[PDB]
Design an enzyme around this catalytic site. Structure first.
Site, PDB file in Angstrom:
ATOM      1  N   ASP A 164       4.855   6.653 -82.972  1.00  0.00           N
ATOM      2  CA  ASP A 164       5.714   7.450 -82.100  1.00  0.00           C
ATOM      3  C   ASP A 164       6.860   6.642 -81.498  1.00  0.00           C
ATOM      4  OD1 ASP A 164       4.013   9.683 -82.398  1.00  0.00           O
ATOM      5  OD2 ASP A 164       3.065   9.370 -80.412  1.00  0.00           O
ATOM      6  N   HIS A 224      -0.150   4.577 -69.436  1.00  0.00           N
ATOM      7  CA  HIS A 224      -1.229   5.281 -70.102  1.00  0.00           C
ATOM      8  C   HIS A 224      -2.244   4.294 -70.667  1.00  0.00           C
ATOM      9  CE1 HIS A 224      -0.321   4.583 -74.333  1.00  0.00           C
ATOM     10  NE2 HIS A 224       0.957   4.807 -74.074  1.00  0.00           N
ATOM     11  N   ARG A 226      -9.948   2.352 -82.008  1.00  0.00           N
ATOM     12  CA  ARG A 226      -9.093   1.312 -81.428  1.00  0.00           C
ATOM     13  C   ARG A 226      -9.261   1.420 -79.918  1.00  0.00           C
ATOM     14  NH1 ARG A 226      -2.631   1.738 -82.755  1.00  0.00           N
ATOM     15  NH2 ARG A 226      -1.912  -0.221 -81.883  1.00  0.00           N
TER      16      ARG A 226
HETATM   17  C1  LIG Z   1       3.137   7.108 -75.625  1.00  0.00           C
HETATM   18  C2  LIG Z   1       2.576   6.199 -76.694  1.00  0.00           C
HETATM   19  C3  LIG Z   1       2.491   6.626 -77.995  1.00  0.00           C
HETATM   20  C4  LIG Z   1       1.976   5.776 -79.003  1.00  0.00           C
HETATM   21  N1  LIG Z   1       1.907   6.270 -80.277  1.00  0.00           N
HETATM   22  C5  LIG Z   1       1.364   5.505 -81.202  1.00  0.00           C
HETATM   23  C6  LIG Z   1       1.302   6.031 -82.543  1.00  0.00           C
HETATM   24  O1  LIG Z   1       1.773   7.102 -82.899  1.00  0.00           O
HETATM   25  N2  LIG Z   1       0.675   5.186 -83.444  1.00  0.00           N
HETATM   26  C7  LIG Z   1       0.167   3.919 -83.145  1.00  0.00           C
HETATM   27  O2  LIG Z   1      -0.343   3.220 -84.031  1.00  0.00           O
HETATM   28  N3  LIG Z   1       0.303   3.425 -81.893  1.00  0.00           N
HETATM   29  C8  LIG Z   1       0.851   4.182 -80.962  1.00  0.00           C
HETATM   30  N4  LIG Z   1       0.997   3.670 -79.688  1.00  0.00           N
HETATM   31  C9  LIG Z   1       0.510   2.308 -79.394  1.00  0.00           C
HETATM   32  C10 LIG Z   1       1.576   1.213 -79.554  1.00  0.00           C
HETATM   33  O3  LIG Z   1       2.881   1.569 -79.076  1.00  0.00           O
HETATM   34  C11 LIG Z   1       1.935   0.847 -81.009  1.00  0.00           C
HETATM   35  O4  LIG Z   1       0.784   0.834 -81.875  1.00  0.00           O
HETATM   36  C12 LIG Z   1       2.734  -0.454 -81.177  1.00  0.00           C
HETATM   37  O5  LIG Z   1       3.436  -0.425 -82.435  1.00  0.00           O
HETATM   38  C13 LIG Z   1       1.807  -1.653 -81.110  1.00  0.00           C
HETATM   39  O6  LIG Z   1       2.523  -2.800 -80.608  1.00  0.00           O
HETATM   40  P1  LIG Z   1       3.239  -3.845 -81.603  1.00  0.00           P
HETATM   41  O7  LIG Z   1       3.658  -3.169 -82.873  1.00  0.00           O
HETATM   42  O8  LIG Z   1       4.183  -4.617 -80.754  1.00  0.00           O
HETATM   43  O9  LIG Z   1       2.035  -4.876 -82.050  1.00  0.00           O
HETATM   44  P2  LIG Z   1       1.636  -6.141 -81.243  1.00  0.00           P
HETATM   45  O10 LIG Z   1       1.418  -5.848 -79.805  1.00  0.00           O
HETATM   46  O11 LIG Z   1       2.456  -7.347 -81.539  1.00  0.00           O
HETATM   47  O12 LIG Z   1       0.225  -6.426 -82.005  1.00  0.00           O
HETATM   48  C14 LIG Z   1      -0.902  -5.628 -81.717  1.00  0.00           C
HETATM   49  C15 LIG Z   1      -2.156  -6.470 -81.858  1.00  0.00           C
HETATM   50  O13 LIG Z   1      -2.293  -6.875 -83.257  1.00  0.00           O
HETATM   51  C16 LIG Z   1      -2.691  -8.245 -83.325  1.00  0.00           C
HETATM   52  N5  LIG Z   1      -1.597  -9.056 -83.879  1.00  0.00           N
HETATM   53  C17 LIG Z   1      -0.243  -8.750 -83.857  1.00  0.00           C
HETATM   54  N6  LIG Z   1       0.517  -9.616 -84.502  1.00  0.00           N
HETATM   55  C18 LIG Z   1      -0.395 -10.546 -84.948  1.00  0.00           C
HETATM   56  C19 LIG Z   1      -0.198 -11.709 -85.711  1.00  0.00           C
HETATM   57  N7  LIG Z   1       1.007 -12.084 -86.145  1.00  0.00           N
HETATM   58  N8  LIG Z   1      -1.290 -12.431 -86.042  1.00  0.00           N
HETATM   59  C20 LIG Z   1      -2.489 -12.000 -85.613  1.00  0.00           C
HETATM   60  N9  LIG Z   1      -2.795 -10.937 -84.868  1.00  0.00           N
HETATM   61  C21 LIG Z   1      -1.685 -10.222 -84.589  1.00  0.00           C
HETATM   62  C22 LIG Z   1      -3.149  -8.631 -81.926  1.00  0.00           C
HETATM   63  O14 LIG Z   1      -4.520  -8.343 -81.650  1.00  0.00           O
HETATM   64  C23 LIG Z   1      -2.177  -7.796 -81.095  1.00  0.00           C
HETATM   65  O15 LIG Z   1      -2.612  -7.577 -79.754  1.00  0.00           O
HETATM   66  C24 LIG Z   1       1.524   4.486 -78.666  1.00  0.00           C
HETATM   67  C25 LIG Z   1       1.651   4.044 -77.343  1.00  0.00           C
HETATM   68  C26 LIG Z   1       2.151   4.871 -76.366  1.00  0.00           C
HETATM   69  C27 LIG Z   1       2.310   4.350 -74.970  1.00  0.00           C
END
Ligand SMILES: Cc1cc2nc3c(=O)[nH]c(=O)nc-3n(C[C@H](O)[C@H](O)[C@H](O)COP(=O)(O)OP(=O)(O)OC[C@H]3O[C@@H](n4cnc5c(N)ncnc54)[C@H](O)[C@@H]3O)c2cc1C
Ligand SMILES: Cc1cc2nc3c(=O)[nH]c(=O)nc-3n(C[C@H](O)[C@H](O)[C@H](O)COP(=O)(O)OP(=O)(O)OC[C@H]3O[C@@H](n4cnc5c(N)ncnc54)[C@H](O)[C@@H]3O)c2cc1C
Ligand SMILES: [Cl-]
Lengths: 525, 525
Positions: free
Chosen positions: B150, B389, B471
């Site tokens: 999203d 949230h 998750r």
């Molecule tokens: C309103 C709202 C809606 C959302 N909708 C969605 C949705 O539709 N789908 C969804 O999937 N999520 C959703 N999310 C959750 C979140 O926004 C996303 O999943 C986001 O993309 C995750 O953060 P990121 O990509 O920065 O990953 P990061 O925060 O960088 O990584 C997530 C986790 O993966 C691991 N990790 C990351 N990089 C590495 C690495 N290089 N080596 C080893 N371990 C690693 C760690 O455990 C880390 O904490 C939503 C959140 C909100 C608030």
């Protein structure tokens, strides 16, 4: 001379056999030379004997598997778990490590535990064959269909555990595997995914569960003995049609592959797994080599032309299946004809248009591609006396020039050993497999040794060109794993650390996929 | 008071910091209280402070990551790897274990290494956001499309590594992940799949490689620091159409889910991931709570009816997208209307018919479902002041009665803790997710503690009903892993053995997914 587990005396082995008999029953432990003959590799590679089992134990339950594992740890006896032990082309039921005991889970652990019509899945024990599952589906008037390999006598579970494949839209078995139960190397039992959540109804619905996703670590693996496995099942479409495209020229391969990819990558109009088989492969399914040539060396050009003319086939023969309402099938077939029809000399046939000998492969593919199990392809082994095969399957990009390179280099090497180039090419969505079968006289020590030496060279030459194999025979597992050596063998070192942690006594299938536990490492076994 | 790694003195920590600066450069190590504030969980759970980072280190290369890991081993410093650190709802960038150093791989490791048009893939470093990849695709006139969650500001890699999801046909990110490079917990580097075969062009084409398939073991995991990851990319269809179905009654959920499943399981006519969102979720996307109700306690029925009427939405709102030639879209939409139209009170709207305030979610889904990244959903957090949230997402069977049970039991508990029931239901093919977002005032310690205590109860009650979460947040990881305890906690014991073997010094993200290395196990951290 009696085959014994490494480091285990005759007397200690006899004691261990009695312990195993106490667990499974006397009649369910085999250990005489004559009893074990049927568990030797049916298609042996190398002149010298190898891959010799010391016994076969047939448990009835997960608890019995746990007890067998505990006994094996106490005595230091290696265990080679199989389901139905029909891994022919890659070693049959035979263990990588000579002297290992085969644990034939499928003999008595052969129940269909559930087939769920609404959600479309089965939960199976290892002994359920494709024929068994098909019989269940047919007798219950199921709206589901299975996905089978070419031969129906194998195990839905065992096949998946070697990352075996079929040819329907559900052809990637591991992809559709959902949940498993496994006895780990010291005898503890574990369920993966939602099976780890007691009372969940989603074991066969959601593969991942929570936390690190482990199921792939039990495929092509020696980290446990699987006792139950779930798999998703596709709904049977309302209609289907299979077709053959014959292409006349060897060099057509390049254009065929370059058209195959764009028609497949979106899963339409090529809805099933596309297979492209050469004339040698299709002729072997319906005829003996001596029908065409009884001389020395590679088959001459004139005999190849005779195979094509007599069978009304091309050098390259494309087989596919379409599914859906008749108008959808018609539209997709029209697109396929339009695209492949750009290759001069291409000819098209549906499964309704070929009742001749040459059309026998089309009829078999029509069964397989519709989840109807078959043994028709066993006729391949009649190509030569005492016929066996070994499978050699490099993975590459779905590119016509890459296909031509592989065709040429494998054929060149095969010619040196007077072995026919029996091959096809298949694509998944984005990857290409060069499926080579080498058929040979298993009773001839020279032929057995030629196969071994030739395939070792093929593995090396493929790796030098940047191609690795997806699966291989016992005799090649060290060689193949040695090719995956980026970063000074980092992948194998990782596997070894995991193996030693889970299997400190080095019991489960030592050497599978080239992964040896500490006690056997560096010993030329 | 200064945040320190457990058991590490001020002076030893300073020495480790200097070693990190020697590797990455002075400006790429953050360790002042003010600098670290921005890396705290933006949506904290619990009244008490938790999940405090001691520093942030931003490496530029795989070799730098290796050196950081080596230093952490020498000094006993725990490392929490992130990509972009936008895991909001599950802890943000903050470590499970207080005092851990964040390794922010994405700050400088942010290159798009390859986008392959012909085979349809990307090879990425962790810092590539969905917006970044979309900008690349658009500026190069690509025929490919991405699959985004999203919010577009996260990482293609980081999202996949937590088994994040999107809503196109390629919505299962982990499924389409193909190849990775990872630094293991003592600093060695490894490539998975065909990346382990030097010179292979198939790293992003064929995921499995040879031998046991490990990539899933690096998702929701603490077994390494990923430095590169490949993913398949779908070709953009020639046309698309999105639609909304409003359902007037709370109790319609049962019938909606029972129709959703048969329309989805064959991937047609519901070609994308079906999502069903309640009125609270859709209202929060476009309005503040006080627009509807300014009183104490749960929103009354009269206010819910006002939300529905003013926004022209139902209690349950279904969103889908269709793809292909116009005639195919028309046929599928006809099937969908015929099927869902059996529910009294259902109304249908296409993305071309509805650009009012209530239709803002439809327009956002049309972007998301077409791989067009968005931040429109950040408006949800304006529902209440200082909005944050937490995500609570149980997995179950795609059954209407199961959906009703979950709806009622979660809403009951939400009401008891004075939290709005903002939820939807989605299906994959065979599995159902109950996607609960609980929005609360992050500045209110009481609200934070209520969220923690409520979600602990929800996890327990869900498990008692046979549901586990896919998750979860840092604060719930121990509780959730404790629910997957079939066979006396067999799954966790397996994970622990692997963790201790690969990470003997207990360095990488201790406690992720409830998996603690030996030195921290049983310590109430
Ligand atoms: C309103 C709202 C809606 C959302 N909708 C969605 C949705 O539709 N789908 C969804 O999937 N999520 C959703 N999310 C959750 C979140 O926004 C996303 O999943 C986001 O993309 C995750 O953060 P990121 O990509 O920065 O990953 P990061 O925060 O960088 O990584 C997530 C986790 O993966 C691991 N990790 C990351 N990089 C590495 C690495 N290089 N080596 C080893 N371990 C690693 C760690 O455990 C880390 O904490 C939503 C959140 C909100 C608030
Ligand atoms: C002419 C020809 C055509 C073929 N075509 C195909 C084809 O189209 N597709 C294809 O995939 N194969 C093909 N094969 C190979 C083979 O026939 C099948 O793959 C067959 O299904 C494998 O035997 P199986 O199912 O009995 O598995 P098994 O022999 O029982 O198991 C295979 C391996 O999996 C592991 N294993 C199995 N069960 C367990 C367990 N319970 N616990 C732990 N590990 C276990 C072991 O390593 C074992 O050696 C072909 C072979 C020939 C000769
Ligand atoms: Cl390491």
């Amino acid at each position: 001379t009696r085959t014994l587990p490494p480091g285990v005396s005759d007397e200690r082995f006899d004691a261990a056999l009695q312990r195993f008999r106490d667990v499974v029953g006397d009649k369910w432990v085999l250990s005489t030379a004559d009893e074990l003959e049927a568990f030797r590799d049916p298609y042996p590679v190398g002149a010298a004997e190898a891959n010799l089992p010391s016994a076969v134990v047939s448990p009835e339950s997960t608890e019995q598997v746990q007890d067998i594992v505990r006994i094996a740890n106490e005595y230091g006896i290696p265990l080679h778990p199989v389901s139905t032990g029909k891994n022919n082309g890659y070693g049959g039921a035979a263990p990588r490590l000579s002297g290992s005991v085969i644990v034939k889970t499928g003999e008595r652990m052969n129940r269909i535990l559930e087939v769920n019509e609404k959600y479309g899945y089965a939960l199976l024990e290892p002994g359920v064959t494709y024929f068994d599952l098909y019989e269940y589906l047919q007798s219950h008037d199921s709206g589901l269909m299975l996905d089978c390999p070419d031969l129906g006598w194998g195990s839905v579970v065992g096949n998946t555990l070697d990352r075996g494949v079929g040819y329907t839209p559900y052809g990637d078995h591991f992809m559709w595997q959902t949940g498993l139960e496994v006895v780990l190397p010291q005898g503890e039992v574990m369920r993966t995914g939602m099976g780890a959540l007691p009372g969940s109804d989603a074991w066969q619905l959601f593969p991942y569960g929570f936390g690190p996703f482990p199921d792939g670590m039990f495929t092509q693996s020696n980290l446990g003995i699987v006792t139950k496995m779930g798999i998703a099942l596709m709904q049977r479409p309302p209609a289907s049609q299979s077709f053959l495209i014959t292409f006349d020229k060897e060099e057509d391969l390049e254009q065929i592959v370059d058209i195959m990819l764009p028609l497949r990558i979106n899963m339409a109009p090529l809805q099933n797994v596309p297979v492209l088989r050469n004339i040698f492969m299709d002729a072997a399914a319906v005829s003996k080599r001596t029908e065409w040539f009884d001389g020395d060396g590679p088959m001459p050009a004139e005999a190849i032309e005779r195979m094509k003319k007599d069978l009304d086939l091309g050098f390259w023969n494309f087989y596919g299946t379409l599914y859906g309402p008749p108008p959808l099938i018609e539209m997709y077939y029209g697109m396929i004809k339009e695209a492949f029809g750009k290759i001069p000399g291409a000819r098209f046939f549906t499964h309704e248009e070929r009742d001749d000998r040459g059309g026998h492969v089309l009829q078999d593919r029509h069964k397989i591609n519709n989840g109807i199990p078959s043994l028709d392809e066993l006729q391949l082994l009649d190509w030569v006396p005492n016929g066996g095969h070994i499978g050699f399957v490099p993975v590459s990009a779905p590119d016509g020039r890459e296909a031509m390179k592989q065709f040429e280099m494998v054929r060149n090497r095969a010619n040196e050993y007077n072995k026919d180039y029996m091959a096809g090419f298949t694509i998944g969505l984005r990857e290409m497999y060069h499926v080579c079968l080498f058929i040979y006289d298993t009773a001839d020590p020279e032929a057995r040794e030629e196969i071994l030496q030739m395939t070792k060279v093929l593995v090396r030459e493929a790796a030098e060109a940047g191609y690795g194999e997806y699966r291989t025979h016992n005799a090649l597992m060290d060689d193949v794993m040695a090719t995956f050596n980026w970063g000074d063998g980092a992948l194998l070192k990782f596997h070894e650390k995991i193996k030693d942690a889970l299997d400190p006594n080095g019991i489960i299938a030592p050497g599978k996929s080239g992964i040896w536990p500490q006690r056997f490492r560096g010993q030329n076994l």
